[PDB]
Write a protein that binds this DNA or RNA. Structure first.
Ligand SMILES: [Ca+2]
Length: 579
DNA sequence: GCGATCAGCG
DNA sequence: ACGCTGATCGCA
């Protein structure tokens, strides 16, 4: 129904200096995945190319790698990475419809061309799920059906660039697309393709030791419970705790008794078994998610894991990381932290370098709220998390453990993002009356933060959305909801999203500036991971001293705020040691 | 497939 | 009854 040329060879009119390009990778994880078909739409017509002909054609490969031949695409990182796995470089992507839709409205959840096109009343393209099917039925359709689908997707991109750019421009987001998110997409593609090397010998030894400890603890649990059961069965775990042993019920779920860690910790005075259950779960989590789960996704020939950073998923502008998630590798308990010993440089005599913004969202908050006291604190480079731990636990600076400071961190963020006296009292195991007074004291020291929390909710009501420093946007329809509980969740989103989102904007700019600086200095150092406000690199040991000066400076100077930004950084033989 | 749970970032 | 996530697991 849509006209196109099913081409048998590449012709010069397919190699124009502006085109919509589709390089179709159907598998969810695009690492080392098949490219099933290619479509090109430009001024001269519409073309479908089989990958075996197009990607072996030297002129088509050259066109893909020529940055002066501009391509408009949807999810260009998926294409870039799949092409890297084919030994082909993609350059010249000047418009990514996925990132444009994400910026316009992240709540749309746009995950294919059809969903983006619907934002602009364009419906002459099918959803990918209607074409490929779902689950066990998923399959590449017959070539004529595939070709028309890929051509229709390219035609949609070709038509949709201008109205998406026009709305981006009206939102003050066109530079956010072109100078931040699209350059970041190329950097993430390099990081994902580079991967992180894993010490599978050490990981597997840890797993064998874990399984022994797990059985020991499992037996002591059966013995403390007087009987055996399925320690992961709620119905059975609930029976043991809250019926057999008759422990108090502090919380319910929609489905029954709650056994979350906060509940178990409050029951520790009543019975030894709850601490064993906690230890059992923590070891099991390491075993299932971080030993077995990681070994599953290691590529055996290179011993590398290749995450996918989802750049158009979170509602605040953060990235997320999937299969494996390398943004939640354990660190806080020593037993879990040892997992990071398995993350190693990819070459001999290279090292891992990790750099982290200090108290990033409080510094962003001080800038946006213009709170005199919070700005003065960071101008003094005070550690507000430590200062809050001193006050909470009534200790001196010297006595603050990493654990008190971790807890004080949740108090600081809890309060500025709208925690109630009830929530605070439950977190600190303190009186509700004390919790409320401490919150009141907190806002006496930082009245500008209070004013900002009030103003930003009003602004979200008037405008219908909130923005970040670099003009990311999040619509909050529920902020005028008549339902108190629904309105309240929206109000805490108005409080949090501009801060968490501006911190996401800053580190993204930092990554672009860092990559350019590393290229300027002709260093071999390169990014491996981003963990929200931390950057993890690897480099030859001979570059470490230059990186100690280069990286903190690039990160500190990415933006200029009313308070300084501050970067902590370490390096070492494994990720474990980069602290 | 979903809810609880828990690993991380703030 | 602070916010943003992803993986595993049992299923009340
Ligand atoms: Ca930090």
């Amino acid at each position: 129904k849509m006209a196109f040329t099913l081409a048998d060879r590449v012709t010069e009119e397919m190699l124009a200096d502006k085109a919509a390009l589709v390089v179709e990778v159907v598998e969810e994880n695009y690492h080392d995945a098949p490219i099933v078909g290619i479509a090109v739409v430009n001024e001269h017509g519409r073309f479908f190319l089989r990958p075996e002909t197009a990607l072996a054609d030297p002129q088509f490969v050259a066109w893909l790698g020529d940055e002066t031949k501009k391509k408009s695409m949807f999810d260009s990182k998926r294409a870039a990475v799949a092409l890297k796995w084919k030994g082909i470089e993609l350059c010249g992507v000047s418009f990514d419809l996925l990132l444009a839709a994400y910026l316009l409205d992240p709540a749309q959840g746009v995950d294919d061309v059809a969903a983006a096109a619907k934002m602009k009343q364009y419906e002459a393209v099918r959803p990918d799920e209607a074409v490929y099917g779902k689950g066990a039925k998923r399959a590449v359709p017959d070539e004529p059906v595939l070709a028309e689908h890929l051509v229709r997707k390219a035609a949609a991109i070709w038509e949709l660039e201008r109205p998406f750019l026009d709305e981006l421009r009206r939102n003050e987001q066109d530079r956010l697309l072109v100078e931040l998110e699209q350059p970041l997409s190329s950097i993430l593609a390099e990081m994902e393709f580079a991967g992180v090397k894993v010490d599978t010998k050490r990981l597997e030894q840890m797993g064998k030791e874990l399984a022994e400890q797990l059985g020991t603890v499992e037996q002591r649990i059966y013995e403390l419970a007087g009987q055996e059961f399925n320690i992961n069965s709620p119905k059975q775990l609930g029976v043991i705790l809250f019926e057999k042993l008759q422990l108090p019920v502090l919380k319910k779920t929609k489905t029954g008794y709650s056994t979350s860690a906060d509940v178990l910790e409050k029951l520790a005075p009543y019975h030894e078994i709850v601490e064993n259950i906690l230890h059992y779960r923590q070891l099991g989590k390491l075993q299932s998610t971080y030993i077995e789960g990681l070994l599953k996704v290691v590529r055996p020939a290179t011993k590398k894991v290749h995450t996918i950073f989802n750049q158009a998923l979170t509602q605040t502008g953060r990235l997320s990381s999937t299969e494996p998630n390398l943004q939640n590798i354990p660190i806080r308990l020593e037993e879990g932290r040892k997992i990071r010993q398995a993350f190693v440089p990819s070459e001999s005599d290279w090292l891992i370098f990790a750099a982290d913004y200090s108290q990033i969202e409080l510094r962003v908050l001080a800038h946006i709220a213009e709170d005199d006291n919070l700005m003065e604190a960071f101008r003094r480079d005070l550690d507000i998390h430590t200062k809050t731990a001193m006050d909470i636990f009534q200790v001196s600076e010297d006595e603050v453990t990493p654990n008190m400071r971790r807890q004080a961190k949740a108090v600081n963020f809890g309060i500025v993002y709208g925690i109630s006296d009830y929530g605070l009292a439950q977190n600190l195991n303190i009186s509700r009356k004390e919790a409320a007074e401490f919150i009141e004291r907190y806002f006496e020291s930082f009245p500008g933060v209070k004013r900002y929390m009030e103003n930003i909710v009003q602004e979200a009501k008037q405008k219908g959305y909130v923005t970040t420093l670099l003009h990311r946007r999040r619509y909050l329809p529920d902020i005028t909801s008549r339902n108190f509980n629904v309105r309240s969740f929206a109000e805490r989103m108005a409080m949090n999203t501009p801060i968490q989102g501006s911190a996401a904007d800053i580190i993204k700019k930092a990554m672009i500036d860092l990559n350019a600086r590393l290229k300027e200095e002709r260093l071999q150092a390169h990014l491996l991971l981003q963990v929200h406000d931390e950057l993890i690199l690897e480099a030859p040991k001979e570059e470490m001293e230059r990186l100690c000066r280069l990286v903190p400076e690039v990160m500190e100077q990415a933006v200029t705020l009313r308070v300084p930004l501050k970067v902590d950084y370490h390096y070492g033989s494994t990720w474990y040691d980069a602290k």
